[PDB]
Structure formats: structure tokens, C-alpha cells
Amino acid sequence: MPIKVGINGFGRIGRMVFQALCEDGLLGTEIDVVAVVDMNTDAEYFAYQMRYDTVHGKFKYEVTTTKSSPSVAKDDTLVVNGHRILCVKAQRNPADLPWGKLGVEYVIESTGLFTAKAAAEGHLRGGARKVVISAPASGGAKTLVMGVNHHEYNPSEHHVVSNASCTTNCLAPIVHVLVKEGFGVQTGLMTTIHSYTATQKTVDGVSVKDWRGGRAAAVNIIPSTTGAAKAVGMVIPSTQGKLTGMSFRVPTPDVSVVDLTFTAARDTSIQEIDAALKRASKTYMKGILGYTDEELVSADFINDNRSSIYDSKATLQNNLPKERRFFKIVSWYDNEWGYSHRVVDLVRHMASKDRSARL
Amino acid sequence: MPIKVGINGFGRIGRMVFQALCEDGLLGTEIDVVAVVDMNTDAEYFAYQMRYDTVHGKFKYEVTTTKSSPSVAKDDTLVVNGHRILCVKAQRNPADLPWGKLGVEYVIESTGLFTAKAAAEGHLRGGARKVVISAPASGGAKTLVMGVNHHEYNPSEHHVVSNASCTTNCLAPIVHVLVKEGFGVQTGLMTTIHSYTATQKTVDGVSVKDWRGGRAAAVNIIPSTTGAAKAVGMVIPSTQGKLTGMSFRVPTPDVSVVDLTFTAARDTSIQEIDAALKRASKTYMKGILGYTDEELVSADFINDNRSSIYDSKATLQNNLPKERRFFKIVSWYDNEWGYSHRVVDLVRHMASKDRSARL
Amino acid sequence: MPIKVGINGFGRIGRMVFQALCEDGLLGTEIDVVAVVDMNTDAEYFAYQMRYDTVHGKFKYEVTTTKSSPSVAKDDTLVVNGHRILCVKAQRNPADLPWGKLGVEYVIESTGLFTAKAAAEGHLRGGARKVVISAPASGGAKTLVMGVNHHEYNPSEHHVVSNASCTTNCLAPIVHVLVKEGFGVQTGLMTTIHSYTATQKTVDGVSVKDWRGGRAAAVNIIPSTTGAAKAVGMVIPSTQGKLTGMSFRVPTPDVSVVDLTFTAARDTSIQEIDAALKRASKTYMKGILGYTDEELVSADFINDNRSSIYDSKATLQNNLPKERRFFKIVSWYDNEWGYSHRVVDLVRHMASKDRSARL
Amino acid sequence: MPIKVGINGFGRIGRMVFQALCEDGLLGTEIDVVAVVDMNTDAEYFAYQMRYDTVHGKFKYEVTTTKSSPSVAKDDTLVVNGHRILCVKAQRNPADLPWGKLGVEYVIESTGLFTAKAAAEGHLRGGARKVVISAPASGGAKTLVMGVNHHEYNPSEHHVVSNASCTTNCLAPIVHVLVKEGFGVQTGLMTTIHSYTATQKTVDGVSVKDWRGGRAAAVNIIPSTTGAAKAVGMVIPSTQGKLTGMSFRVPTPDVSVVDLTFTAARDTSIQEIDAALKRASKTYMKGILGYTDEELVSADFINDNRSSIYDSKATLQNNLPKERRFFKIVSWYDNEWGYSHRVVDLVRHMASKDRSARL
Numbered sequence A, B, C, D: 001m002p003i004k005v006g007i008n009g010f011g012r013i014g015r016m017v018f019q020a021l022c023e024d025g026l027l028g029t030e031i032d033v034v035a036v037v038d039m040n041t042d043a044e045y046f047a048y049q050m051r052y053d054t055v056h057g058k059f060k061y062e063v064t065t066t067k068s069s070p071s072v073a074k075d076d077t078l079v080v081n082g083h084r085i086l087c088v089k090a091q092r093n094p095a096d097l098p099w100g101k102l103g104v105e106y107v108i109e110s111t112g113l114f115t116a117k118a119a120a121e122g123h124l125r126g127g128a129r130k131v132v133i134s135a136p137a138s139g140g141a142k143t144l145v146m147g148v149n150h151h152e153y154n155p156s157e158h159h160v161v162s163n164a165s166c167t168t169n170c171l172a173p174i175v176h177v178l179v180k181e182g183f184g185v186q187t188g189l190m191t192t193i194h195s196y197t198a199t200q201k202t203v204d205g206v207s208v209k210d211w212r213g214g215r216a217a218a219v220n221i222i223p224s225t226t227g228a229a230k231a232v233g234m235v236i237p238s239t240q241g242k243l244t245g246m247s248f249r250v251p252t253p254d255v256s257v258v259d260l261t262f263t264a265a266r267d268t269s270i271q272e273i274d275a276a277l278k279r280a281s282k283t284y285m286k287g288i289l290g291y292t293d294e295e296l297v298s299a300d301f302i303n304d305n306r307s308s309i310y311d312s313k314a315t316l317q318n319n320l321p322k323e324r325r326f327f328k329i330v331s332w333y334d335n336e337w338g339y340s341h342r343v344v345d346l347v348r349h350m351a352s353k354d355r356s357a358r359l
């Protein structure tokens, strides 16, 4: 029996989460995507959105539409290689969602609207058992980063969890290696050079909570505060209060880069750090941390499924000769694609643990 | 008397109408902007928005804020050249706006929410005498294009009017000159190569009424239907049914161009046409239709106050040799800025006529 | 027996011809790419250029490098799928190139420096038998557009040919269908909304032969004259003097669109034209002309192998109701990719004809 | 009375220096621009380039062109406010270029091809006295940064100087303040998020000396090594070997930002640093170092003539609370505008010291 999954919110992440599932052959074997929800039930429009993607190209699998019953006016069901997905109408309140009627057990919460634990807990009243919030959460939801602290998931305690942010998923693997291998981090500040996102504006618009963020996205460099570096504190508790950073939002539609500057806890060298990151990526961080030693630019990381892709040449070439403590590490991430894979990874991990906890 | 103006909507459209008015030296002298009405009343934010523009640069005057009474916590009044503008909270119904109490006679309706004549007529109940919709209108509002048909304004009959669209304001002066000068138009098709706008999306997103328009704006050429060419029929009734057109939305934040292809009603030449357009711009179309014979690109038309800037070189170089009927005309427009000045021009024209009708 | 091919010029144009050749699975079996010629001999850089593409993604074939003889300083040979490719140095005169010694029969002339029939004829003195200029040519070189007039190729007369331009390859199939299906073309004007190209400038630069062309490419709409519509008169001689046009260069890195406005030679309808275009694309224009009836934007045509992709929705929605003569047709092209495959198609066609004519 | 100056390399940098030479209102009175030189001598083309700027808008002074002698085909003399400027033809070698015959002492070297001191010394043999390289130099030329070490100019020992790079001119004022205020700098790493430049490519192209730098500029984040931070160690000798950095080239046409992370030599706070930068900006650094406490984005710094504009909000919000040593400072620069004003500022400073000590 496949894991019965519902996706609440069918946008960049919702759809990329679905692409990941499909491409890795999980659909209908490991995971059953029972339903997807967005603004309407117009399956033809959902199919169009899945089929064509400015950044990630044409969806390579056929998407067709059909009716759940003849009593329905328009197609409300997606069909992907025989797999049927009901398109359900959005709700203001998660507890009204028919998860129980649908047999959905795991909900991927990707609207951006229910990041408060109490809000997301709505899904549990609707019949679901577990919720993965595809973003930082508030209200004490356990935060899990695949490859860093995901084994801290506890089936009997953790029902609404957060998969953190794409940025935290790039940074945390790096910091994890530094901490685990005994380099340590005394202090660190991160800058992410970040592609614009759905929240931004095409031309100067209205943004009362984020004045800079209201300015035209694809013509400016736009600074922002970010919780990503501080969030590593919750995932790697020893780093609590030692890390913060900021974002510069720049005119690319996808792919971002972390520029971490930090002080190590012991004498080391960039060469030693470089060697450790490469080893980690070949071993205990495989599939999470990758690396390159080629002359790559942002377009070259499109569709990379790793959380963090360490840039060896950028890092080795741009550090201080002979330096023992104060270093810069550069790492890339396809902010849509790697993160979406991590959501799927996390659901799979949770289901495995839930199964085990039964007996 | 300085005419008493209120602006409903102080998003980008209302903002730029205000900035154009100020640029013309009109604030506190010819026009009393009494109030702006909007979701937010944070004058500080409004002042920030006026002060800095990604496209149009720095505002020529200083903007400060103050309080309407010592009681208010956050500044709720804008000040420019000594002139106070109250920031008023938006109302669900225009009927409920305090235009009567504020002594506002003319309302610039820029929200895009009240483009139906009967909806905009609510301002009249609110206390206003006249409404200019800064967009195409429905429900029978008289449409007026400065330099083309504005003299059709009838003070006793027209209380809710439309200034049409920026595109119609580019195209109509061209068609007007072709008809007035005896070339005639048998049939025409227009293409506008158009900067992206606020209605578009940074990344691929939901756009139920415009699928193409949901796609990432700054990395796509995005076709669209448009009403601009058909609308010319309403200001030049003899072209009714002879014109239509489309748009290609492209990754520039401002400035657009009309590419008009048409059949003349008599044998002529592109040289005759070129000469007529130039003659008209220097005379009866002065301030509305301009022209260039220089090697200009879109950036060169930023902050141009004219409705239409005929590209003599692009036109003369790209027509068929010896052709007598089938022609292309190229004309530019700062889609934000010319239109803003036209909204002001129209209010001023209506005001002069209203007063002439009374005294 | 596979044909022996050399690529004069291995810039972006030459590169993509090669990738297209591999994509069709012709390397080794149908075509032998014996050598490339460039100012550069470095092969490692070539492999890097071949491996990563900002627009077209990652090359699906593994590229390694090696030496032709252990005597040479650095690698001078590319290895794709076990197939070896020599890198030779550029010559002042094409007569000096060693095609005869290399055993190369067919040369793809993609430098742009030997656009004249006489200059490109040097390749024949260098031991080659046929030349394909991957650009418009002068000096009376035969211009061949696949699916339009390629059967006009004559093995004993035509030894140096042109594959025209990417824009001509988009427009010509459209005009060809209009002519062959009996609609005809009395007059037409074409506008291409064109992605920026290598010849353009990142920031306002120097471009003495094209003043507008020197301006910042990714932030301007930039008009240009073009020869593409005129060149259709060479391919479809009945249209000589009936067609011209222009382009607007816009801020996208690849994919362009033709906007053709024309008067038919008989009374017809947009519905009749739409049906003919679709019928043609399924039959005698298969692989050259395609169509969509979906809500597509420029990204959706990336990596499309067709010369011309007719946009049925954009065409049907944006024509004049009940019109019998004056029509607009919209058609897309990946300006790099469709054309690259056509260069390869032409070579294959010339090969098989040369084979038959020798028999 | 006026300084006899000749701009060599009337490209981007050459022109903007010239515009700064006029913007300050000193053409004719204090500085006499004798001659400019690019490759062509089309005054008409030069005037067009000067009139229209994609980034900086319309030039505020009217430009005309005339002939110097009736014997030559087209004009070769520019006229700005009555002041006449000749357009001499470039030489491949600076020594062949006739500066003495023209009577030019101060030459602004802005071709970018004569960055070697020995090669740039040719200007002297050609008949000129003083040279200012508008870029970093190699071979032992004296590097001067306005507001930092410009008073180290030695009128008898320094003939071919360097105004550094725009990035160095942003970073140096910051570090200078840190050093002079007693904060100290133990170690520093700098990242510049840099607008693309003329050396970059519209689409993937050939860049043998920088593989990443050949990739399409307006659609990629492109990392690069830089010398700007190391160059500061040369201009502020107490920091030699203690600073380095890198850049990320992003899709904006102008304006850049320095992200400096450093370790102070003793206990301080971000509040003390912030207060110090503000004070310095108002005092000893006035006109070189500016600051903002507003919510600005890159477009807002277009036309700012300061070398470095410290971002107070971005700095104060994105540091670690109660930290005493490890800090991030964010400072902006119009990489075109500020630097051009400094080139003018330097020549003028050199002018006085040359005629007070050596005269």
C-alpha cells in the first residue's frame, strides 16, 4: 500500500514536489497522490501548469484530464501515466478539507498560508495524520532538515513538522559537516544571492511589511533580512546565536547561492575544509550535499536535486592565503527543485518511521 | 479657482497621475489635490513610494509627511510645496467616500475596481460632481482621448468619463491623423510590443483569466489579446469594425511601441504619411503626438509626456518600395508617463468646460 | 557510407549544429564529423562549451578530450560517444584548409566571415566538394530552405549554398503554405519579436553600422531593419518585391516570434488559413512547420526542432471579424535550435542527392 | 588657467568621465577638454552616444558637431556649451599617438588595453605629461584613491597613475574609516554583487581567460575572482595580506554592492561602527563616503556621485546581536557614475600639486 498524500497548494513548490515524485517513479508505488488543491478544480488548467514550466522545461510525462463522475460540469481529475489525482477546491480553513473522505494520511502544506502550527493542525481535524509544512513554521512545529537532523523525527510526538526553507537546506548541510568533523563554527554570517520569487513584484508595487520587497524584482538588487542562518540554530542547536545573515534578491527566476563567512573553532585551512566537504558529499551527505569543481554559473544548477552544491573552485580561489580561522564557503541550490525533493524525502522518512512505530 | 481633486486609488497609477500633475507645476496653483484614498494611510510609505522610482528616478519635488491632528499616531498627510494631501482610507462603496465633506469636485478613479459607469457613479453620491476613470470603461461612460475627440466632452451630459488606455492613447493620434488628413483607413491590424505590468507574475503563477499572462513575466515573450485597437472605434467612429490588434508582453519594466499595419483608402506613399504625421505633431497634435528621426530605443522614451512618438526612421526604412496602399507605422509611448499626463490634461479640460458652462 | 563533415567556425552557431547532429543520432553512423576549425585549438574549453548551455541545458552526451599524437602540447581532439573530432586552426583563406587531406567532403561554413559565394568557394580549393553557409549569402549563392525549395538543389551546379537565416526559415514555410494552398500573397509586412543575439551589447557600446544595435540589449526594445522577409523572394520567387519587414530585439536570450500581416490573393478567411496551416504541418510540411493551439509563451518553444511553429490561438483570436483579405499570422521559432537542425537536414539532403547524381 | 585634458578611450568610461566633467559645471572654466578618441571619428555618432544613455538618462547639455577643416569628409569636432572638442584617430600604439603636437599634458587612459604601466607610458613619448589609468594597473604604477590616499601623489615621481577600480573605490573608504577610527581590521573577506559590464556577453560566448565570464550575462549569476579587496591592502598598507574577495555578476545594467565581512582588532559593536561611518561621511569623508537609512534598492543609487554609500539599515539589521568582533558592512556604488566623478576629482587634485611644487 502506497502512502496516501494530499497536496494543499499547487504552485512552484506544490508542482515541483509532484514532478519529483513522478520522475523518481514513486507515484503509485511508494506514494499515492490522492488530491491536489489550489484555487479552482479546473483540471485542464492544472494540466497546463504542470505541462509547461518556464524554468524547468516541458514536463516529460503525459498529463490528461477526466471527470470524477458524470455529474461534474468540467474535468476535475488529472491523470498522469494512469495515476488519477482529484483536484479539490481550496479552503480558507484546513479542517474543512475532505482528507478523511479521501483517505489522505499525509498532507504537504505548500500554500504559504498555514505555516503557524495551530493553523496546519487544521488538517488533522480534516482527517489527516501528518502534515509537512513546506516552509519555516511558527508555534513550536518540529523542524527537520534531511541529512542533518531528520532522524530526530518522533512519530508519537511530531505530527505537524516543518521542512525549513530552501536557504536553510543549502546552509545547514555545510554547517553540519563543519560541526560534525570538529572544525566548529564560532561565529558566522551568511549572504544568499537569491532568485526572485512569487511574493515579489513585476513593477514597483505595494509591500507594507517589506518596502524594499515591493520594488521591481527583475531590474533591481533588493536586500532583505532572512531567518535562514538563524534557523540552523534549531537544526544544529550548538550553533544557536552564532549565525545570522541576509539576502540579496537579484533578477534571475530560479537558482540561488549561499556565501557563508565564518570563524572556525580550531586552526584549519580552506584546503582541509574543501577536502572534508567533498568526502562528506561522497559518503554520509550523499544526495544532500554535492560539489562541483567546474566553472559553473547559475543556469548549470537548474534541476540539481541536491540541497547544497558546494563550489570548490569559487571557494578555493577566493580565500585568504595561509589563513587558519576566517573562511568563505560558496554553495549553490536550485531553490525550487532541490527543496521539493527534500519534501518528498521527508514524507518518505516519516512514513517509514510511522510504520516502524506501529510495532 | 484651483480645482478640487481627489484620487481614488494610490497604487502606481494614482501615484503617477499625482507626480505628473506636480511636474506640470499645478499643485496648489491650478489643482488642489485634497485627498488620496487607498487601503493604506501610512503617509511615510506613500512618501517613500513617490521619492524613489525604479523606472522614473527621483521625484523633482520634496515630499514630507505630517499629521492632520496631533492625535494621529502615524503621519497621515503628505506635503509637497506646502500643499497638504490627506491620506484617506478606502471604502467598499464609492458612495461612502467623504468627497462632499472634503469639497472634492473631480475624482480620479484609478483603482481598476470601478470601471463600470454605474459603479463609478457612486462617487457622485459620495459628493463629487465628476469622475475620470483612468482606464477603459464599460456601461456607457463617454471615452475621451486628448487631441483626438476631447472636444466632445459635454458638461451637462458627461459626469463619469474614461480616458481610455495608454495603448489607445498611442494608437488613436496616429489613426486620427490618417483620417483627418485624407489618407483614410480601410483595414488595420495593430501589434503592441509592451512592457510587463503589475498584473503579471514574477514566476509562473495562477492566472485564471489569462493563462499566458500567468507565466514568468521577465523571461518570456507573452502574447495577449487587447481592446486598444477596437476602442479606437469609440473615439473615431468611422474606424468602427476596421481595426483590431494584439500585444506581445516583453521583459522591459516600462515603455512600449505600436506597430500599426493598415490599408489606406486612397493611393498614397509612406513619404506622404511621414510628412503628414510630422506636420500634425507640430500643429494640431502638438503635445500629444511627437516624432523622432533619431536612432532611439525604448529607454530614450522614459519620461516622455506625449501620448505617441512616431518613429520616422523605423517607419521610412521598413515599408515596401513604391507601395501605394499597404503600410506600417511605428510609434512609441511611455505607457506609464504619457497616460498620466493625459489624465491630468483631461481633468483640466473638463474643469475649463464646466466653468464656461456655468459662468 | 557516412558523409565526412567539417565545421568551419566552432562558435555558438557551429556548436549547436553539432549538438543537433548528435540529438538526431547521426554521429558515427550517418555523419562523420572529421574536424572543427576555429581560432582556438584548445579542446578542454570546447568540451566545457559543449557540456553546458544557459538556454538549452546540459548536453546528454559525454565529452572527453585527448591528443591526436602524443607530440602535441595540449589536447586537440574531442571525443563524443567514442567518436573522435580533430580541432584545427583557422586560416586566412579557406583554400589553405586541409579538407582533402582530412577527407572532408561537406563543410558547414558558420564563421560569418565567408558569406560571399567566392570567398566560401575557397573551401573547394581546399579539397571539399560542398559548402553550406549557415547564414544568408551574397555573390549569387543558392539559397535553400528545407520544406520550401530544397528540391531546387542541383548537385552539378550548386556546390556552395546558403541555408538562409533562422528568421527566413520561420517565415518561408508560412508563406509557402499560403502560396501552395491557393491563398496567395499580394503584399505582406513582417515584424519579428526577436531574442537578443551575440552581436548585441550587454551595456551601451559601440556599433557604428547599427546605432540602435549598440544599446544595452537586456534592458531595451531595439528596432532593427531585417532582410528575412525580402529573402523569402529568393526562396519563393513569386513573392519577390511583395514582402519586407523589421524586427524588435527584446530582452530574452533565445526564442523569437514572427508577426506576419498580409493581404491574400483571393477572398478567404482566417479559418480557412488556420485549417490549411494545420493540414500542411501534418502532411507535406511535417517536421518543418508545426502548430500549437495551447496558451504558450516563448519558454515553451525552447528546444523545438521545427523551423516554424504556428500559433493557432494567437492567430484566430486577433484577426478582424469576417475579414476576407487582410490577415495576421503568428508563428514562433527557437532561433538557435530549429535552424541548427535545418543546417543538418540540408547537408543530409545534399548528400543523398549527390549520391544519386553520381549513380 | 584651464587644465589641458585629453580623454583617450572615448568608450563607456571615457564618455561618463566627460559627462561628470560637465555635470559638475566645470567645462571651459577650470577644465578644457581638448580632444577625445575612440576608434572612429564620427562626431555625429559620438554625439548620439553622449545624448542618450540607457541607464543615466538624457544628457542635460546640448551637443552639436562641426568640421575642423574642410578637407575631411565628415565632422570631427564636438560642441558642448560653445566648447569645441576634437575627435582624433586612435593608434595601435600610444607612442605613435600625437599628444605633444596637440599640446596635451593630462591624459585619461580609458581604453582598457593599456593597463601595463610600460605600455601606458607611451602616452608620454607621444608628447603627453601626465597619465591617469581609469583602472587598476600592473608594472609598478602609483594607485590613488580619493579620500583615502590621494595626498600621497608625488608630482616628481608619479606620472602614470591609477584611480583604482570602481569596486576598490567602494571598499577603500569603508576600510579607511575602520582603520582611522581605531576599530582595526584583523582579517576581511569581501563579496561584490556586481552589475554586468561591457566585457560580458549577451549570449554564451568565447571567454578564454574567464570561462564563467563568457556565459550569458543577463540570465545568470556568474561568480568571479577579483583583485579589489587585495588592492586595498596596497592603498591602505596596514591591511596588506589581510583582505581578499570575489564577485558575483548579476543581471542588472548598473549599480553594485559591497558585502564586507571582517574581524575587528578589538572589542566594538555594530552600533559604534555605524555611528562612525555616519560621522565620517559628514566630515573627513564628505563627498566620498555617503550613507542611507532608507529602504533603498539598486536603482535608487543610479547617478549617486559618492564612491561608497553605506547602507545603515541593511548593516544594522543583519549583524549578530551583542557581537564584539565579527561584522558585516553593506555599501553601494554606482560602478559607472561615482568612479567617473573620482577620475575628475583626481585630475583636479593632481593639477594643483603639479603647479605648486614642480612650478
Ligand SMILES: NC(=O)c1ccc[n+]([C@@H]2O[C@H](COP(=O)([O-])OP(=O)(O)OC[C@H]3O[C@@H](n4cnc5c(N)ncnc54)[C@H](O)[C@@H]3O)[C@@H](O)[C@H]2O)c1
Pocket: A008, A009, A010, A011, A012, A013, A014, A037, A038, A039, A090, A091, A092, A110, A111, A112, A113, A134, A135, A164, A165, A166, A167, A197, A198, A335, A336, A339, B204, B205, B206
Ligand atoms: N519557491 C521557492 O523557491 C521556495 C523554497 C522553499 C520554500 N518555499 C515555501 O513554499 C511555500 C510555497 O511557495 P511557492 O514559491 O510555491 O509559492 P506559489 O505562490 O507558487 O505557490 C502557492 C500556491 O498556493 C495556492 N493557494 C493559495 N491559497 C490557497 C489555499 N487556500 N488552498 C490551496 N491553495 C492555495 C496559490 O494559488 C499558489 O498556486 C511558501 O511557504 C514558500 O516560502 C518556497
